[PDB]
Amino acid sequence: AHALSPRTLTAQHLNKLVSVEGIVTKTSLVRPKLIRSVHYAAKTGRFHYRDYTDATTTLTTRIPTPAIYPTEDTEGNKLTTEYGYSTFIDHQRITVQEMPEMAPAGQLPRSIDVILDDDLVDKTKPGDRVNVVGVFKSLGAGGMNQSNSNTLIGFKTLILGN
Amino acid sequence: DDDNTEIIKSFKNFILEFRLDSQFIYRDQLRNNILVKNYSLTVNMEHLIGYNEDIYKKLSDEPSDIIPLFETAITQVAKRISILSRNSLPTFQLILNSNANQIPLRDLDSEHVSKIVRLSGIIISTSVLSSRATYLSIMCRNCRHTTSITINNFTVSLPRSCNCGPDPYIIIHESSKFIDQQFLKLQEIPELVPVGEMPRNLTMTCDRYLTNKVIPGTRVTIVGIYSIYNSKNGVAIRTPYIKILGIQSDVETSSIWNSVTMFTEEEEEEFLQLSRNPKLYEILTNSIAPSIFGNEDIKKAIVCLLMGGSKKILPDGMRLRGDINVLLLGDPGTAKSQLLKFVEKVSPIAVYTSGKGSSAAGLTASVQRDYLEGGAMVLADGGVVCIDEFDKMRDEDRVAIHEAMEQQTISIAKAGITTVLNSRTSVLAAANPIYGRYDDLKSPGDNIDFQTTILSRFDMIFIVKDDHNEERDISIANHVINIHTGNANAMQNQQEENGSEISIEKMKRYITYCRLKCAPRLSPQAAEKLSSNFVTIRKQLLINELESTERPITIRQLEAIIRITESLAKLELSPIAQERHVDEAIRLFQASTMDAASTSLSEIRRFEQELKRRLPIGWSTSYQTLRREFVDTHRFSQLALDKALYALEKHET
Amino acid sequence: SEIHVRISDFPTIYSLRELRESNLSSLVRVTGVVTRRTGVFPQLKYVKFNCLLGPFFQDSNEEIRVNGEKTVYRNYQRVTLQEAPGTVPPGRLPRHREVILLADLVDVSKPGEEVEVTGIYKNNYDGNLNAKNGFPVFATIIEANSIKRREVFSWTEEEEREFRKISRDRGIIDKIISSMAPSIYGHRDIKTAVACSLFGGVPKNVNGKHSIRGDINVLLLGDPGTAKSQILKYVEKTAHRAVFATGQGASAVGLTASVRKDPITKEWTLEGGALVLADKGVCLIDEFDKMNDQDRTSIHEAMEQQSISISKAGIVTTLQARCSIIAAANPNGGRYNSTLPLAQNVSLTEPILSRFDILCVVRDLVDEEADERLATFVVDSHVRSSPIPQELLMKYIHYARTKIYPKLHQMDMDKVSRVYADLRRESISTGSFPITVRHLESILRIAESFAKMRLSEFVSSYDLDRAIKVVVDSFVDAQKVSVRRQLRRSFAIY
Amino acid sequence: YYDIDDVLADGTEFPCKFQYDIPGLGYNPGRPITKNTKLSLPLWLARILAIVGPVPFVELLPPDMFSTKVMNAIKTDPVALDLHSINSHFFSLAIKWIMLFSEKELANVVSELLLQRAQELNHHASSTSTFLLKLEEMEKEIYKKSHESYKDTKRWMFK
Amino acid sequence: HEVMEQQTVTIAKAGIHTTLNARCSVIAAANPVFGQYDVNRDPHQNIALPDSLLSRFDLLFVVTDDINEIRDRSISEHVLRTHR
């Protein structure tokens, strides 16, 4: 519908599933991302965990959890970080340029960025023909959040998944 | 806000009651716009000011506080037209273009800020789209207040009230309605008023339906409000921009789509009328160089180049291509460097790059980092590329070319992009030969660098010269005397247009036509005829080279001859080749062979003196010695020094 | 509803470098060259709104301690004024001060020019250092008042009605040439070219397509020790708009239009090369041979299409440089490198050279009389401690270029065609090529330049004679020594 | 029949394989064509070869155009689907192939698609943009007829 | 030289100092080392890339496309038959 190349997109296609296709560059470097916080109390024991909600958590927007570690959740018991029980989903982003051969004119190429969650990571080297899919997400304030205005530029967009 | 009710009632009464005798232009502008799903309206101010002077009195007073009450005013109208009840319907954008009085770019200084300003300038580059917001929901980090904020325009901070604080409001992006934005940046026209200074460029934000309306480089006349933004870079120093409502391009200037794979109808008619000309080929060969005299072989060769050729996708993956190549190489006065400018004009998609490319764009396909930056071989894919100083091109991309021209595909392994794209271009190159006529006395090849391989890849090589004949020289001269004044010679082309010749504005459309429509194929007797051709070539010219006569023959050349036959077949437009048709081609390429066919003082070559009684060890000399010894001797060129060196190397001295 | 008074000269007249605390809050005159100026960014000034506090004036320049509805903006511009290079005492750097223009004073200034300003002196407010100073040190900013050029020349009714009677004599041409480069002692030829190209041509647009070119591009091919530099320097003094780009390296401007980040911290301003800056004027370049190709392509393009196109960064245009190029070039190696042709004599490629219509080649050896003639001139110079006064000629040129547009008449000028033939074929027997119909067109254009010096309103046979001698001897002198054989047919052309 | 659209509709190639051997190949030096050879045939000849036989002369392998991927993709967004790219003939063609193979299932499908285009084509019946480019030729012809009725009725509406 | 026969690569760079193994097989195509005099030209001076390299390569094959007339016609016929 929703069939679109990246050149034709924004905004009627925003907050709607999308299949982009084009060349992928430059393929940002693979990096961990924290999700589940896991801790151990002693001698009170039990097992204690926090759940970290990032910007790309689930899909839907949620009140941001981050950051750092809970560190003496009541009562005053010590909490050591338990590494290797706690869950880390890998995370990456890769920008996508429209196909060079369907470019209309000497007009400059327009690329948009795709975040690749979990398994999808490291599945594509840069310069490869790719048809991404994903939900088209607009993240970040446009500057409206603070109280400085700055300029008119705003609401950078990217695709989650998929 | 009863006043806004009072204003909007006047805008509704302006849309519903407006009458140009007798259709309602606006009201139907609306319907015919919602049906195509345009969701826009274009008001004509003259009608507006005709209707009430008042609402234009306020609209030229405080535009940015009013115009959105006009938007809501019109979308409240489309609610009563496009649908009926007893969704969703975005608030339409209005685009108003009107005459007024043009206010040049230099003359914008304050004082009219927030007052609608019509003006005119050439757009430089268009900025990549980005979304602003229109309607976005917001929830609180704590009390979780659900607030739907209608943002308008008319930067705007979020409300802090339902600890709580200071600004506990999150943007919900799952329900938020977004629009688009552009950022044109426009340089005022070069005619007026640059004087001695570089012309200023005001930054403009197009939005919604005006976005991507204009290709960068096209003259336009913008309307829009004039206003200022902050953008920390004191004190206070706020910087100027022009919001656009709404843009209107000049009538002619690549309004699009000047490139339609189908064209019109009457065009097929008159084309198919041109296919019926016996002198069609002949009259075309007269279209290309109205100005350029002589050089008929080149003159025809251009024609057979533009028309493409046989293109085969046949299995396996190997695909033969079209169309050929052309070398104009020769001493100046050949007009080749001008001729290229002409081909560049005619060819449907063409890029003239002499280099080494020029200026900041790499010679064709180019790797630039944020990906393919698009260049000659790229930006000009599927068509003609014009190159000059072909011998003066850099090494690393020379490889790229040599590999490209045959398989049409160039592989780029640079950095994080290993892409393997596709250049369907057919290179037309004009080299500059060295030392003049003696290079003809020299072996015909051996010219380009140390290697003839270049000339091997190239199918049609034309050695030319600025030959002077009193007959012809008086022809060209007298022609120029005519050119200066009394001026009126360039009319001959025009009566050629009335009587016979093609306007070249039409030639292009024609070329596109023939290029897409039909793909020619050769006949068997023509084939065997060309077999005889090539075996006679091989045998005879071998016999010629029994003596080790220094010059060549490749099956690639044969393939060229083929591509010429299909090209010319595609001129007639016929789906099939004929024998005589080829009979032209053989001879034409024969002229090319004649070009393939065509003592030394030895002064400099007398490197013996140095090698001897100067240096038995050769050391402490080498290329260095030859310099100092020939550096202040008024004497030695790089090719000269090497030639004499290579010469003596070979000579065995 | 406001008029702020300009207040002409107020001595004082204190030097830029000479300033103290005693000048605070008190109006003081300053003078010196402008350096590149910021673009025009409307300042806040008056504050007003529909309510809803009242109007708040802010400020110059604090703004402590925003609404807006209808606010009266006034253009601001900050220009950095540097002290004039000629007036600098030895062993001292040219210190400089900030200048704040307001309202109409905006855009009156242009970089490269000396400007006389009456503005008052200001400080506020520290401002910002406090890190590397050690002390509570304020900034120094002259809020400007008036703007004047230094301290301007134009034709005038009495001066022109006087003037016209001078241009009527035929020999005025020769007198002018003799006036054109006084201190060199020069040559009659090499100055003739200068006069010709400096003086003008006719553009001249053919409806509606192509304008040909209305200028004369002088290649002055020098020789070590020959005057080849100094001549063109004259042109920078005399001509209205004349620009000195040197070779490269560079003496600003640097010949290539490029959009460059600004000094200190500022928004990105576009800038032209010598070409754009000098439009309609005269562009003056020397030592082509030392130029990096990056520039070479720029000059070539400029000569070719009469416009410079810039595609970077986001800004995309074609600026228009119509400049006449006058060049100084240095032959490869020695004075006369070979009997071999000019194109062989010097490094510059033949196609870039073809664009130049007039080639001035200097030669070749001294001599009794030549040493006389020279020495008298040099000695004359050092001892100091017919031609028109320089002022009236440098007015003359501008006058004629503005007012008059000479034109040929088709009837009797057909002769020229014949001449071309007479030149063409007979020249093909020896030497290559160089002749071409271009080289015909230059005849006409140069001729009508002389028609401008005559203030003639139309082209005459005399003008033709002059021109043909110029271009034909130009062509002769380029060729190899075999051109001696050429000379014998020049007689009828003479 | 005489109209150009039909006789052009018969011009289209189909992947139909032969049930039998046929020496005297008219297509080259076989001479016979081996059984179960897959040869593309235009519709005009292939139309009655599936009837005349009690085993027919040809299998009628379903055309790539009718691939169940397509007949599925046209059930999502017809209005944005590009017909003019695939054949370009569809309704002129598909109408024959539904009778030839006597397939009921897709009737209900195409009978829907053609309503969905038309509820869009009464929208461009009011006085293009890009969309006019992706219609099927015959459908396009109907667009001429409608647009002309409207244009003419508007030109009559005033003076 | 180090790659081909010796069969290993050695990097003393800066640096990581190691002898790492590349035991690759190798093909190479070169021109006629200036001047088409590849056919008639001497067994030496023709190659253009002395010396040990000439040895390292196990097999040096020569490809002068020189008739061999009766061989040209056959090649042409073959190419023709192929063009299908």
Curated annotation (Swiss-Prot), chain A:
Source organism (scientific name): Saccharomyces cerevisiae (strain ATCC 204508 / S288c) (Baker's yeast)
Job of this protein: Acts as a component of the MCM2-7 complex (MCM complex) which is the putative replicative helicase essential for 'once per cell cycle' DNA replication initiation and elongation in eukaryotic cells. The active ATPase sites in the MCM2-7 ring are formed through the interaction surfaces of two neighboring subunits such that a critical structure of a conserved arginine finger motif is provided in trans relative to the ATP-binding site of the Walker A box of the adjacent subunit. The six ATPase active sites, however, are likely to contribute differentially to the complex helicase activity.
Location of this fragment in the whole protein: 163 to 324 of 971
Quaternary structure and partners: Component of the MCM2-7 complex. The complex forms a toroidal hexameric ring with the proposed subunit order MCM2-MCM6-MCM4-MCM7-MCM3-MCM5; loaded onto DNA, forms a head-head double hexamer. Interacts with CSM1.
UniProt protein name: DNA replication licensing factor MCM3
Family the UniProt entry places it in: Belongs to the MCM family.
Extra information: Present with 35100 molecules/cell in log phase SD medium.
Domain of life: Eukaryota
Gene name of this polypeptide: MCM3
Subcellular location: Nucleus
Curated annotation (Swiss-Prot), chain B:
Domain of life: Eukaryota
Gene3D superfamilies, sorted: 2.20.28.10, mini-chromosome maintenance (MCM) complex, chain A, domain 1, Nucleic acid-binding proteins, P-loop containing nucleotide triphosphate hydrolases
Disulfide bonds: none
Every MCM domain range: 280-481
Note from the entry: Present with 10300 molecules/cell in log phase SD medium. Early fractionation of eukaryotic MCM proteins yielded a variety of dimeric, trimeric and tetrameric complexes with unclear biological significance. The MCM2-7 hexamer is the proposed physiological active complex.
Quaternary structure and interacting proteins, as annotated: Component of the MCM2-7 complex. The complex forms a toroidal hexameric ring with the proposed subunit order MCM2-MCM6-MCM4-MCM7-MCM3-MCM5; loaded onto DNA, forms a head-head double hexamer. Interacts with CSM1.
Function: Acts as a component of the MCM2-7 complex (MCM complex) which is the putative replicative helicase essential for 'once per cell cycle' DNA replication initiation and elongation in eukaryotic cells. The active ATPase sites in the MCM2-7 ring are formed through the interaction surfaces of two neighboring subunits such that a critical structure of a conserved arginine finger motif is provided in trans relative to the ATP-binding site of the Walker A box of the adjacent subunit.
Protein name in UniProt: Minichromosome maintenance protein 5
Swiss-Prot record, chain C:
Record note on what altering residue 228 to A does: Reduces MCM2-7 complex helicase activity. Abolishes MCM2-7 complex helicase activity. Reduces MCM2-7 complex helicase activity
Positions occupied by motif Arginine finger: 354-357
Gene Ontology CC entries for this record: CMG complex; cytoplasm; DNA replication preinitiation complex; MCM complex; nuclear pre-replicative complex; nuclear replication fork; nucleoplasm; nucleus
An annotated GO BP: double-strand break repair via break-induced replication
Statement: the UniProt record of this protein carries the keyword Cell inner membrane: no
UniProt-reported outcome of changing residue 355 to A: Loss of MCM2-7 complex helicase activity
Catalytic activity: ATP + H2O = ADP + phosphate + H(+)
Protein purpose: Acts as a component of the MCM2-7 complex (MCM complex) which is the putative replicative helicase essential for 'once per cell cycle' DNA replication initiation and elongation in eukaryotic cells. The active ATPase sites in the MCM2-7 ring are formed through the interaction surfaces of two neighboring subunits such that a critical structure of a conserved arginine finger motif is provided in trans relative to the ATP-binding site of the Walker A box of the adjacent subunit.
Quaternary structure and interacting proteins, as annotated: Component of the MCM2-7 complex. The complex forms a toroidal hexameric ring with the proposed subunit order MCM2-MCM6-MCM4-MCM7-MCM3-MCM5; loaded onto DNA, forms a head-head double hexamer.
Name of the protein in question: DNA replication licensing factor MCM2
Organism: Saccharomyces cerevisiae (strain ATCC 204508 / S288c) (Baker's yeast)
Taxonomy of the source species: Eukaryota, Fungi, Dikarya, Ascomycota, Saccharomycotina
Swiss-Prot record, chain D:
Recorded superkingdom: Eukaryota
Protein name: DNA replication complex GINS protein PSF3
Gene Ontology terms: cellular component: CMG complex; DNA replication preinitiation complex; GINS complex; nuclear replication fork; nucleus
Keywords linked to the UniProt accession: DNA replication, Nucleus
Name of the encoding gene: PSF3
Entry function: Functions as part of the GINS complex which plays an essential role in the initiation of DNA replication by binding to DNA replication origins and facilitating the assembly of the DNA replication machinery.
Oligomeric and partner information: Component of the GINS complex which is a heterotetramer of SLD5, PSF1, PSF2 and PSF3.
Miscellaneous comment: Present with 2205 molecules/cell in log phase SD medium.
Similarity comment: Belongs to the GINS3/PSF3 family.
Keyword set includes Nucleus: yes
Localization annotation: Nucleus
BP GO terms, sorted: DNA-templated DNA replication; double-strand break repair via break-induced replication; mitotic DNA replication initiation
InterPro entries xref list: GINS_A (IPR021151), GINS_bundle-like_dom_sf (IPR036224), GINS_Psf3 (IPR010492), GINS_Psf3_sf (IPR038437), PSF3_N (IPR055221)
